[PDB]
């Protein structure tokens, strides 16, 4: 009840900033996450005994992969926390509850491979879920952990508040399928331009929340250059292992996943910042003005990659 979590002074201050790094001490990440729920949603919204048990079961169900790991889960939750705290009044009691949990659970039991590799490998999950394969699994894994005895952090919501929040979490997690992002941003762009965008239209909220999810998920591109650069290594460690596995199936992988074409990474990041990151945080800043720091940090990192190409690093 009266058990507020407290961070050391530097974390207490820096955790409020979009570009915060949660640090290399694994055993503080749970406290950091509870700190963020308590400040974002209230000390009341979850029972601490149940939340703490949910967090540790979620941690156990992330794998020891180079990038799609427990640290990614908490990093993406922290980005959502920054967006929610900078857009205080635009989001309902339930949405804050559901989105921080969605972000923590959005990559549960990720094996380090894309939806494409599952389909070409012919993994069972690819027969169970024809599209958004890993994302339907991540949501499925979220529901399984909530149904463990003592793990229902939502127990004290009405039947209808309970169905609302599991619907928020499902849409939230599916939306991290980047193949869905391109169309979702195009529609938000069109609706903001023409003036039709209306946050009282539930189907318009859905789209906005989806872009928030893409923005939090991609937020490695919004950190200080040393963090961005060192995360890129982990991202490529998975891409290249997947390329390795493509070649074992007798398929030449795309260059992104071919460790022979490692030379061309700087140019590939340019592509990705230009085609995905910049449009994502631009459209997000238009809809939610106070998220501008994400756009500014992304532009700075674009500029840092331009300097790598030009031999200046
Ligand atoms: C920093 N975050 C990410 O990179 C990130 C995080 N989520 N997702 C999906 C990405 C991502 O798709 N990145 C891309 C996208 C296209 N690329 C093409 C190349 C490339 C080509 C030729 C030689 C070397 C590389 N590299 C790329 N990287
Ligand atoms: Cl506050
Ligand atoms: Mg994912
Ligand atoms: Zn993710």
CSV table of C-alpha atoms and ligand atoms in Angstrom, one decimal:
chain,number,residue,atom,x,y,z
A,1,UNK,CA,0.0,0.0,0.0
A,2,UNK,CA,2.5,2.6,1.3
A,3,UNK,CA,5.5,0.8,-0.4
A,4,UNK,CA,6.6,3.3,-3.1
A,5,UNK,CA,9.7,2.1,-5.0
A,6,UNK,CA,12.6,4.7,-5.1
A,7,UNK,CA,15.5,4.9,-7.6
A,8,UNK,CA,18.9,6.5,-6.8
A,9,UNK,CA,19.0,10.2,-7.7
A,10,UNK,CA,20.5,9.9,-11.2
A,11,UNK,CA,18.0,7.1,-12.3
A,12,UNK,CA,15.0,9.0,-10.6
A,13,UNK,CA,15.9,12.0,-12.9
A,14,UNK,CA,17.1,10.2,-16.1
A,15,UNK,CA,14.2,7.6,-16.1
A,16,UNK,CA,11.8,10.5,-17.1
A,17,UNK,CA,13.8,11.2,-20.3
A,18,UNK,CA,13.0,9.4,-23.6
A,19,UNK,CA,16.7,8.5,-24.1
A,20,UNK,CA,17.2,6.8,-20.7
A,21,UNK,CA,19.2,3.5,-20.8
A,22,UNK,CA,18.1,1.0,-18.1
A,23,UNK,CA,21.8,0.0,-17.5
A,24,UNK,CA,23.6,-3.4,-17.3
A,25,UNK,CA,22.3,-4.5,-13.8
A,26,UNK,CA,19.6,-7.1,-14.7
A,27,UNK,CA,18.4,-7.3,-11.0
A,28,UNK,CA,17.2,-3.6,-11.0
A,29,UNK,CA,15.0,-3.9,-14.2
A,30,UNK,CA,12.0,-5.3,-12.2
A,31,UNK,CA,12.1,-2.4,-9.7
A,32,UNK,CA,12.5,0.1,-12.6
A,33,UNK,CA,9.4,-1.5,-14.2
A,34,UNK,CA,7.3,-1.4,-10.9
A,35,UNK,CA,8.6,2.2,-10.4
A,36,UNK,CA,7.1,3.1,-13.9
A,37,UNK,CA,3.7,1.4,-13.3
A,38,UNK,CA,3.4,3.2,-9.8
A,39,UNK,CA,4.2,6.7,-11.3
A,40,UNK,CA,2.3,6.1,-14.6
A,41,UNK,CA,-0.9,4.5,-13.2
A,42,UNK,CA,-0.9,4.8,-9.4
A,43,UNK,CA,0.4,2.6,-6.5
A,44,UNK,CA,-3.2,1.0,-6.5
A,45,UNK,CA,-3.6,-0.3,-10.1
A,46,UNK,CA,-2.0,-3.7,-9.3
A,47,UNK,CA,-1.4,-5.8,-6.2
A,48,UNK,CA,2.4,-5.8,-5.6
A,49,UNK,CA,2.6,-9.6,-4.7
A,50,UNK,CA,0.8,-10.4,-8.0
A,51,UNK,CA,2.7,-7.8,-10.1
A,52,UNK,CA,6.1,-9.0,-8.8
A,53,UNK,CA,5.1,-12.6,-9.6
A,54,UNK,CA,3.9,-11.6,-13.1
A,55,UNK,CA,7.2,-9.7,-13.9
A,56,UNK,CA,9.4,-12.7,-12.9
A,57,UNK,CA,7.3,-15.2,-14.9
A,58,UNK,CA,7.5,-12.8,-17.9
A,59,UNK,CA,11.3,-12.6,-17.3
A,60,UNK,CA,11.7,-16.4,-17.3
A,61,UNK,CA,9.7,-16.7,-20.6
A,62,UNK,CA,12.2,-14.4,-22.5
A,63,UNK,CA,15.2,-16.3,-24.0
A,64,UNK,CA,19.0,-15.7,-23.9
A,65,UNK,CA,19.1,-14.2,-27.5
A,66,UNK,CA,21.3,-11.3,-28.5
A,67,UNK,CA,18.5,-8.7,-28.9
A,68,UNK,CA,14.8,-9.9,-28.4
A,69,UNK,CA,15.5,-10.5,-24.7
A,70,UNK,CA,14.3,-9.3,-21.3
A,71,UNK,CA,16.4,-6.0,-21.6
A,72,UNK,CA,14.5,-5.2,-24.9
A,73,UNK,CA,11.2,-5.9,-23.1
A,74,UNK,CA,12.0,-3.4,-20.3
A,75,UNK,CA,13.6,-0.8,-22.6
A,76,UNK,CA,10.4,-0.8,-24.8
A,77,UNK,CA,8.2,-0.5,-21.7
A,78,UNK,CA,10.4,2.5,-20.5
A,79,UNK,CA,9.9,4.3,-23.9
A,80,UNK,CA,6.0,3.8,-23.5
A,81,UNK,CA,6.3,5.2,-20.0
A,82,UNK,CA,8.0,8.3,-21.3
A,83,UNK,CA,5.3,8.7,-24.0
A,84,UNK,CA,2.5,8.2,-21.4
A,85,UNK,CA,4.0,10.6,-18.8
A,86,UNK,CA,4.5,13.4,-21.6
A,87,UNK,CA,0.8,12.9,-22.8
A,88,UNK,CA,-0.7,12.7,-19.3
A,89,UNK,CA,-4.4,13.5,-20.1
A,90,UNK,CA,-4.8,11.9,-23.6
A,91,UNK,CA,-4.9,8.3,-22.2
A,92,UNK,CA,-7.5,6.4,-20.0
A,93,UNK,CA,-6.7,4.6,-16.7
A,94,UNK,CA,-6.9,1.2,-18.4
A,95,UNK,CA,-4.8,2.2,-21.5
A,96,UNK,CA,-1.8,3.0,-19.2
A,97,UNK,CA,-2.3,-0.3,-17.3
A,98,UNK,CA,-2.5,-2.3,-20.6
A,99,UNK,CA,0.2,-0.6,-22.7
A,100,UNK,CA,3.0,-0.9,-20.0
A,101,UNK,CA,2.1,-4.7,-19.7
A,102,UNK,CA,1.8,-5.0,-23.5
A,103,UNK,CA,5.3,-3.5,-24.0
A,104,UNK,CA,6.8,-5.9,-21.3
A,105,UNK,CA,5.1,-8.9,-23.0
A,106,UNK,CA,5.4,-7.8,-26.7
A,107,UNK,CA,8.3,-10.2,-27.6
A,108,UNK,CA,7.6,-13.1,-25.0
A,109,UNK,CA,9.4,-16.4,-26.0
A,110,UNK,CA,11.1,-14.8,-29.1
A,111,UNK,CA,13.6,-17.3,-30.6
A,112,UNK,CA,15.6,-14.6,-32.4
A,113,UNK,CA,14.1,-15.2,-35.9
A,114,UNK,CA,11.7,-13.2,-38.2
A,115,UNK,CA,8.2,-14.3,-39.3
A,116,UNK,CA,9.9,-15.0,-42.7
A,117,UNK,CA,12.4,-17.6,-41.4
A,118,UNK,CA,9.5,-19.5,-39.5
A,119,UNK,CA,7.5,-19.7,-42.9
A,120,UNK,CA,10.5,-20.9,-44.9
A,121,UNK,CA,11.6,-23.3,-42.1
A,122,UNK,CA,7.9,-24.4,-41.9
A,123,UNK,CA,7.8,-24.0,-38.0
A,124,UNK,CA,4.6,-25.2,-36.3
A,125,UNK,CA,3.8,-21.6,-35.2
A,126,UNK,CA,3.7,-20.7,-39.0
A,127,UNK,CA,0.8,-23.3,-39.5
A,128,UNK,CA,-1.0,-22.1,-36.3
A,129,UNK,CA,-0.8,-18.3,-37.3
A,130,UNK,CA,-0.5,-17.5,-41.1
A,131,UNK,CA,0.3,-13.7,-40.4
A,132,UNK,CA,1.9,-11.8,-37.5
A,133,UNK,CA,3.2,-15.3,-36.5
A,134,UNK,CA,5.6,-14.4,-33.6
A,135,UNK,CA,3.2,-11.6,-32.5
A,136,UNK,CA,0.1,-13.9,-32.1
A,137,UNK,CA,2.5,-16.3,-30.2
A,138,UNK,CA,3.7,-13.3,-27.9
A,139,UNK,CA,0.0,-12.4,-27.1
A,140,UNK,CA,-0.9,-16.2,-26.6
A,141,UNK,CA,2.1,-16.4,-24.2
A,142,UNK,CA,0.9,-13.2,-22.3
A,143,UNK,CA,-2.6,-14.8,-21.7
A,144,UNK,CA,-1.0,-18.1,-20.5
A,145,UNK,CA,1.1,-16.2,-17.9
A,146,UNK,CA,-1.9,-14.2,-16.7
A,147,UNK,CA,-3.8,-17.6,-16.1
A,148,UNK,CA,-1.0,-19.0,-13.8
A,149,UNK,CA,-2.4,-19.1,-10.2
A,150,UNK,CA,-1.5,-15.8,-8.4
A,151,UNK,CA,-0.5,-14.1,-11.7
A,152,UNK,CA,-3.8,-12.3,-12.6
A,153,UNK,CA,-2.7,-8.6,-12.1
A,154,UNK,CA,-6.1,-7.7,-13.6
A,155,UNK,CA,-8.2,-9.8,-11.2
A,156,UNK,CA,-9.8,-6.6,-9.6
A,157,UNK,CA,-11.2,-5.2,-12.9
A,158,UNK,CA,-14.9,-5.8,-13.9
A,159,UNK,CA,-15.6,-8.4,-16.5
A,160,UNK,CA,-15.9,-5.5,-19.1
A,161,UNK,CA,-12.8,-3.5,-18.0
A,162,UNK,CA,-11.0,-6.9,-18.1
A,163,UNK,CA,-12.1,-7.6,-21.8
A,164,UNK,CA,-11.3,-4.0,-22.8
A,165,UNK,CA,-7.7,-4.3,-21.4
A,166,UNK,CA,-6.9,-7.8,-23.0
A,167,UNK,CA,-8.2,-6.3,-26.3
A,168,UNK,CA,-5.9,-3.2,-25.8
A,169,UNK,CA,-2.9,-5.6,-25.1
A,170,UNK,CA,-3.8,-7.9,-28.1
A,171,UNK,CA,-4.0,-5.0,-30.6
A,172,UNK,CA,-0.9,-3.4,-29.0
A,173,UNK,CA,1.2,-6.6,-29.4
A,174,UNK,CA,-0.1,-7.5,-33.0
A,175,UNK,CA,0.8,-3.9,-34.0
A,176,UNK,CA,4.6,-4.6,-33.3
A,177,UNK,CA,4.5,-6.7,-36.5
A,178,UNK,CA,6.5,-4.1,-38.6
A,179,UNK,CA,4.8,-5.4,-41.8
A,180,UNK,CA,1.6,-3.8,-40.4
A,181,UNK,CA,3.3,-0.5,-39.5
A,182,UNK,CA,3.7,0.8,-43.1
A,183,UNK,CA,-0.1,0.8,-43.8
A,184,UNK,CA,-1.0,2.0,-40.3
A,185,UNK,CA,1.3,5.1,-40.5
A,186,UNK,CA,0.1,5.8,-44.1
A,187,UNK,CA,-3.5,6.0,-42.8
A,188,UNK,CA,-2.6,8.1,-39.8
A,189,UNK,CA,-0.6,10.5,-42.1
A,190,UNK,CA,-3.7,10.8,-44.5
A,191,UNK,CA,-6.1,11.3,-41.5
A,192,UNK,CA,-3.9,14.0,-39.8
A,193,UNK,CA,-3.4,15.9,-43.2
A,194,UNK,CA,-7.1,15.8,-44.3
A,195,UNK,CA,-8.2,16.6,-40.6
A,196,UNK,CA,-10.4,13.5,-40.0
A,197,UNK,CA,-8.1,12.2,-37.1
A,198,UNK,CA,-10.4,11.9,-34.1
A,199,UNK,CA,-9.1,10.3,-30.8
A,200,UNK,CA,-12.8,9.7,-29.7
A,201,UNK,CA,-13.1,7.3,-32.8
A,202,UNK,CA,-12.0,4.0,-31.0
A,203,UNK,CA,-10.6,2.7,-34.4
A,204,UNK,CA,-8.5,5.9,-34.6
A,205,UNK,CA,-7.1,5.4,-31.0
A,206,UNK,CA,-6.2,1.8,-32.1
A,207,UNK,CA,-4.1,3.2,-35.0
A,208,UNK,CA,-2.4,5.9,-32.7
A,209,UNK,CA,-1.6,3.2,-30.0
A,210,UNK,CA,-0.3,0.9,-32.8
A,211,UNK,CA,2.2,3.7,-33.9
A,212,UNK,CA,3.2,4.3,-30.3
A,213,UNK,CA,4.0,0.5,-30.1
A,214,UNK,CA,6.1,0.7,-33.3
A,215,UNK,CA,7.9,3.9,-31.9
A,216,UNK,CA,8.7,2.2,-28.5
A,217,UNK,CA,9.8,-1.0,-30.2
A,218,UNK,CA,12.2,0.9,-32.5
A,219,UNK,CA,13.4,3.2,-29.7
A,220,UNK,CA,17.0,1.8,-29.9
A,221,UNK,CA,17.4,4.4,-32.8
A,222,UNK,CA,16.3,7.2,-30.2
A,223,UNK,CA,19.1,6.7,-27.6
A,224,UNK,CA,22.5,8.5,-27.3
A,225,UNK,CA,24.9,7.4,-30.1
A,226,UNK,CA,27.0,5.0,-28.0
A,227,UNK,CA,23.8,3.1,-26.9
A,228,UNK,CA,22.4,3.1,-30.5
A,229,UNK,CA,25.8,1.9,-31.9
A,230,UNK,CA,26.2,-0.9,-29.3
A,231,UNK,CA,22.5,-2.0,-29.6
A,232,UNK,CA,23.0,-2.2,-33.5
A,233,UNK,CA,25.7,-5.0,-32.8
A,234,UNK,CA,23.0,-7.1,-30.9
A,235,UNK,CA,20.4,-6.4,-33.6
A,236,UNK,CA,22.8,-7.6,-36.3
A,237,UNK,CA,24.0,-10.6,-34.2
A,238,UNK,CA,20.4,-12.0,-34.6
A,239,UNK,CA,20.0,-10.8,-38.3
A,240,UNK,CA,23.3,-12.6,-39.2
A,241,UNK,CA,22.4,-15.9,-37.3
A,242,UNK,CA,19.1,-15.9,-39.2
A,243,UNK,CA,21.0,-15.4,-42.5
A,244,UNK,CA,23.2,-18.3,-41.5
A,245,UNK,CA,20.0,-20.4,-41.0
A,246,UNK,CA,18.6,-19.2,-44.4
A,247,UNK,CA,21.8,-20.5,-46.1
A,248,UNK,CA,21.4,-23.9,-44.3
A,249,UNK,CA,17.9,-24.2,-45.9
A,250,UNK,CA,19.6,-23.5,-49.4
A,251,UNK,CA,18.2,-19.9,-49.6
A,252,UNK,CA,20.5,-16.8,-50.1
A,253,UNK,CA,19.3,-14.3,-47.4
A,254,UNK,CA,18.7,-10.6,-48.0
A,255,UNK,CA,21.9,-8.6,-47.5
A,256,UNK,CA,20.7,-7.3,-44.1
A,257,UNK,CA,21.1,-10.9,-42.8
A,258,UNK,CA,24.3,-11.8,-44.7
A,259,UNK,CA,27.4,-11.4,-42.5
A,260,UNK,CA,29.5,-11.4,-45.7
A,261,UNK,CA,27.9,-8.0,-46.6
A,262,UNK,CA,28.7,-6.6,-43.1
A,263,UNK,CA,30.8,-3.9,-45.0
A,264,UNK,CA,27.4,-2.3,-46.1
A,265,UNK,CA,25.7,-1.9,-42.6
A,266,UNK,CA,26.2,1.9,-42.4
A,267,UNK,CA,24.2,2.3,-45.7
A,268,UNK,CA,21.6,-0.2,-44.4
A,269,UNK,CA,20.9,1.8,-41.3
A,270,UNK,CA,20.5,4.9,-43.5
A,271,UNK,CA,17.9,3.1,-45.5
A,272,UNK,CA,16.1,2.0,-42.4
A,273,UNK,CA,16.2,5.4,-40.7
A,274,UNK,CA,15.0,7.0,-44.0
A,275,UNK,CA,12.3,4.3,-44.8
A,276,UNK,CA,11.0,3.4,-41.3
A,277,UNK,CA,12.4,5.3,-38.2
A,278,UNK,CA,12.1,9.0,-39.5
A,279,UNK,CA,8.6,8.6,-41.0
A,280,UNK,CA,7.5,6.7,-37.8
A,281,UNK,CA,8.6,9.4,-35.2
A,282,UNK,CA,7.6,12.3,-37.7
A,283,UNK,CA,4.0,10.9,-37.9
A,284,UNK,CA,4.1,10.3,-34.1
A,285,UNK,CA,5.3,13.9,-33.3
A,286,UNK,CA,2.5,15.3,-35.6
A,287,UNK,CA,-0.2,13.3,-33.7
A,288,UNK,CA,1.5,13.7,-30.2
A,289,UNK,CA,3.6,16.9,-30.1
A,290,UNK,CA,5.4,16.1,-26.8
A,291,UNK,CA,7.1,13.0,-28.4
A,292,UNK,CA,9.3,15.3,-30.5
A,293,UNK,CA,12.5,14.3,-28.5
A,294,UNK,CA,12.2,10.8,-30.1
A,295,UNK,CA,12.2,12.5,-33.6
A,296,UNK,CA,15.2,14.8,-32.7
A,297,UNK,CA,17.3,11.8,-31.2
A,298,UNK,CA,16.5,9.7,-34.3
A,299,UNK,CA,17.6,12.6,-36.7
A,300,UNK,CA,20.9,12.9,-34.6
A,301,UNK,CA,21.6,9.1,-35.0
A,302,UNK,CA,20.8,9.3,-38.8
A,303,UNK,CA,23.4,12.0,-38.8
A,304,UNK,CA,25.9,9.8,-36.8
A,305,UNK,CA,25.5,7.0,-39.4
A,306,UNK,CA,26.1,9.6,-42.3
A,307,UNK,CA,29.4,10.4,-40.4
A,308,UNK,CA,30.3,6.6,-40.3
A,309,UNK,CA,29.8,6.2,-44.1
A,310,UNK,CA,31.9,9.3,-44.8
A,311,UNK,CA,34.9,7.6,-43.1
A,312,UNK,CA,34.8,10.1,-40.1
A,313,UNK,CA,34.0,7.1,-37.8
B,1,LIG,C1,18.6,-0.2,-35.4
B,1,LIG,N1,17.4,-1.0,-35.6
B,1,LIG,C2,17.2,-1.8,-36.7
B,1,LIG,O1,18.0,-1.9,-37.6
B,1,LIG,C3,15.9,-2.5,-36.7
B,1,LIG,C4,15.0,-2.7,-35.6
B,1,LIG,N2,14.0,-3.3,-36.0
B,1,LIG,N3,14.1,-3.6,-37.3
B,1,LIG,C5,13.1,-4.3,-38.2
B,1,LIG,C6,15.3,-3.1,-37.8
B,1,LIG,C7,15.7,-3.1,-39.2
B,1,LIG,O2,15.0,-3.6,-40.1
B,1,LIG,N4,16.9,-2.6,-39.6
B,1,LIG,C8,17.3,-2.7,-40.9
B,1,LIG,C9,16.4,-2.6,-42.1
B,1,LIG,C10,16.9,-2.7,-43.3
B,1,LIG,N5,18.3,-3.0,-43.5
B,1,LIG,C11,19.1,-3.2,-44.6
B,1,LIG,C12,20.4,-3.4,-44.1
B,1,LIG,C13,21.7,-3.7,-44.7
B,1,LIG,C14,21.8,-3.9,-46.1
B,1,LIG,C15,23.0,-4.3,-46.6
B,1,LIG,C16,24.0,-4.5,-45.8
B,1,LIG,C17,24.0,-4.4,-44.5
B,1,LIG,C18,22.8,-4.0,-43.9
B,1,LIG,N6,20.3,-3.2,-42.7
B,1,LIG,C19,19.1,-3.0,-42.4
B,1,LIG,N7,18.6,-2.9,-41.2
B,2,LIG,CL1,3.0,11.9,-12.6
B,3,LIG,MG1,8.6,-8.6,-32.1
B,4,LIG,ZN1,10.3,-5.8,-29.9
